[PDB]
Write a protein that binds this ligand. Structure first.
Ligand SMILES: Cc1cc2nc3c(=O)[nH]c(=O)nc-3n(C[C@H](O)[C@H](O)[C@H](O)COP(=O)(O)OP(=O)(O)OC[C@H]3O[C@@H](n4cnc5c(N)ncnc54)[C@H](O)[C@@H]3O)c2cc1C
Ligand SMILES: Cc1cc2nc3c(=O)[nH]c(=O)nc-3n(C[C@H](O)[C@H](O)[C@H](O)COP(=O)(O)OP(=O)(O)OC[C@H]3O[C@@H](n4cnc5c(N)ncnc54)[C@H](O)[C@@H]3O)c2cc1C
Ligand SMILES: O=c1ccn([C@@H]2O[C@H](COP(=O)(O)OP(=O)(O)O)[C@@H](O)[C@H]2O)c(=O)[nH]1
Ligand SMILES: O=c1ccn([C@@H]2O[C@H](COP(=O)(O)OP(=O)(O)O)[C@@H](O)[C@H]2O)c(=O)[nH]1
Lengths: 364, 363
């Protein structure tokens, strides 16, 4: 039709890359761009100095209930079945989280059945008018003491806020159980890409219709490169030059280490609600299924400043986003999709859905 | 506006130049039709977790202190002296041919001093040496030429050593000593973490934008650039106006085995057997520790991606006709193995690029 590209996609993570593949399979000329020197966004993996497969930006475990998302992804990767399991260091023990029958019995030295632990949870639970805060969701189900041990400290360390300063959506992510299930997810499809996300993303972007541009801020090229439409997957407040001020995103620092032993942790991840500066340690071999004479772990330190990783879900922040959203829905030739761009605390599968949905919209 | 340079190809040629140009403040756009950087020297991890080179074994070696020190700013080193065995007469023998090759082959017991006289007694004298047959035959004799060189060369090029310039089979000198190293260079070492990691450091500058999966022709029309550095094949750049320049290609067959070690050295050559010219085992080269092993067999091909220029008098003439157009380009600089039609090693390409950088700065 004209010079340049039909689409200019800003960001090569799940949001941007899914659309890039859909548009290009549809015959669109697509330029995908990322300020980072690699594709895959947060989900990027690679081999470290020791030859172990890791995630530079923390542990990404894939899980979904969407047969459609799982089948779409199945087009670009084979799978390694895996059901993630997390232990929480509490009172010098490693207990299951989410809280379940075993957590209670092990913590207090009880012997409740699955039927009795309901009466117990009910016997300590705090009555809450209406549930609004992350404090509310937890305390109204399992009571004050279990809240202090598992949720209050972790949350304050992770967010820099009390759970009461956070939307109930936040801690509602980790629901309590009364059975003896110890998986962090009870999703239908739990599995990791056989050869890593990066290999999966490379297939996703392999069309002749797709051009990949790296180490590039869209603003550096958007001036002299012709494109008929733009898909932005970065932060919003930044897209509109913070005109309304800074939309708060919580950040992280990662400290990777390699140990001359086959196994360091009992599970993929151990949470630290009450001790240490880090929130958790992850061991990639548990996740990937890789065999190696050594192992590599990563420690996560929450940070107020740095690359945005988490939207900060709270009443005041929801308001501030709306104003930016208004500008966004107003943007004539720009479509906003992704965790950062639409300010949603989304998992990988959720972003893939929202991207696939957005694709269908771009075709009436 | 736009970029000061458009660099076509992210191999050694383009990457060294990207780095040098960017370092001096220039805005660079390096592009490649491949999905990765590094060109031929690109390495990666296979499904088994073994570090391999998708495009055949790349072993770094050099006599140039300046090239090694330049590269040393983007990678650490694993000292490595590549050793190659040739499968001849049912034995695994040292190549280049040396004292031990001859002694073991013919069941002799010569000293270094005697083997000079032996080679002399079998050598066919050639008045003026012009072909790959001459260089070999005029030194080691007809028989040894047949065992190690003729079969291999015919298989690799589809040409007889006599139809190739003396420079081809001259890359493999004959020895009278007992040195079994393939190279005798001063600096022989591998990038500690592979080439890709090194390239990544070479292209880390904020003044470098990287475009992959892109042929320059797809963006040349709407992207502003003041000068172009071209590292691809020459004939393709001028749309084959003088007909096609002969390049030689390869097919690679990669295998993984459930054993720690398959071969006795990094590479085994087959001058006289099989459809492949050689077999390589990457662990000997990388030094990686793994419970399994990955090898690659190389099959010479007439058609495919260009890997080797074909050094012969009629091909020199043809290239010159293209080299003439290249010089009249005025805003395109040609550099590399493919772009200047030279059978260059990695270190030679780096030198060529560093030199070209100097010329461009007037230095
Ligand atoms: C620590 C951590 C752990 C996680 N664990 C899980 C998990 O276990 N399971 C799960 O399902 N999900 C997990 N996730 C969530 C998952 O990462 C997200 O669902 C996913 O990253 C969403 O991708 P996205 O494309 O929307 O955003 P992103 O992955 O962040 O992609 C945005 C990209 O755009 C680029 N960009 C931004 N601005 C510009 C610009 N101006 N110019 C050019 N490029 C730009 C950025 O560099 C970035 O690469 C985790 C996330 C984090 C941070
Ligand atoms: C099988 C094999 C084994 C080798 N072993 C050794 C060794 O052991 N030791 C050693 O020192 N050297 C070795 N070499 C030689 C070494 O690989 C080269 O010297 C080196 O690759 C030089 O890189 P280059 O940048 O000049 O060319 P290349 O690496 O080929 O880079 C050229 C790039 O330009 C791109 N390109 C071309 N045309 C276009 C276009 N139209 N649009 C966009 N992109 C384009 C190509 O995709 C390619 O990536 C070996 C070579 C081969 C083939
Ligand atoms: O052991 C835990 C695990 C979770 N959380 C809270 O639940 C939220 C969601 O945790 P999840 O692991 O699902 O989020 P992630 O960090 O993985 O993105 C966290 O931010 C915490 O506030 C907690 O308090 N204790
Ligand atoms: O065992 C050998 C090794 C090399 N050669 C000849 O020497 C040339 C250069 O060998 P080299 O190993 O340097 O080629 P490359 O590794 O670049 O493919 C080849 O083309 C062959 O013609 C040969 O005949 N037998």
């Amino acid at each position: 039709e004209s010079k340049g590209f039909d689409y200019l996609i800003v960001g090569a993570g799940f949001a941007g890359s899914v659309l890039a593949e859909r548009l290009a399979s549809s015959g669109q000329r697509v330029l995908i761009v990322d300020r980072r020197p690699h594709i895959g966004g947060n989900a990027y993996d690679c081999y470290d100095d020791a030859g172990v497969l890791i995630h530079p930006y923390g542990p990404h475990i894939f899980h979904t209930n969407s047969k459609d998302v799982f089948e779409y992804l199945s087009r670009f990767t084979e799978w390694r079945p895996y059901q993630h399991r997390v232990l929480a260091s509490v009172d010098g023990q490693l207990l299951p989280i989410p809280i379940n029958l075993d957590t209670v019995n092990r913590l207090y030295g009880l012997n409740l059945t699955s039927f009795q632990v309901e009466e117990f949870f009910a016997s300590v639970a705090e009555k809450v008018e209406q549930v609004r805060t992350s404090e509310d969701v937890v305390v109204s189900k399992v009571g004050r003491d279990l809240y202090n041990k598992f949720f209050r400290g972790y949350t304050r360390k992770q967010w820099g806020l009390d759970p009461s300063e956070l939307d109930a959506s936040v801690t509602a992510r980790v629901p309590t159980r009364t059975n003896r299930d110890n998986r962090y997810f009870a999703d239908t499809y739990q599995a990791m890409p056989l050869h890593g996300y990066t290999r999966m993303f490379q297939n996703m972007l392999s069309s002749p219709n797709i051009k990949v541009m790296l180490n590039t801020d869209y603003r550096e090229i958007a001036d002299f490169i012709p494109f008929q439409h733009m898909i932005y997957t970065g932060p919003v407040d930044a897209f509109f030059d913070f005109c309304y001020g800074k939309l708060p995103y919580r950040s992280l620092e990662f400290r990777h280490e390699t140990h001359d032993t086959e196994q360091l942790l009992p599970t993929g991840t151990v949470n630290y609600p009450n001790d240490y500066a880090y929130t958790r340690v992850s061991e990639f071999k548990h996740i990937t299924g890789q065999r190696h004479h050594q192992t590599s772990v990563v420690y996560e330190y929450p940070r107020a400043e740095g690359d945005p990783y988490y939207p900060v879900p709270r009443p005041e922040n929801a308001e501030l986003y709306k104003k930016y959203e208004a500008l966004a829905d107003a943007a004539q030739d720009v479509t906003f999709v992704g965790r950062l761009a639409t300010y949603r605390y989304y998992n990988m599968d959720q972003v893939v859905a929202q991207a696939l949905a957005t694709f269908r919209r771009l075709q009436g």
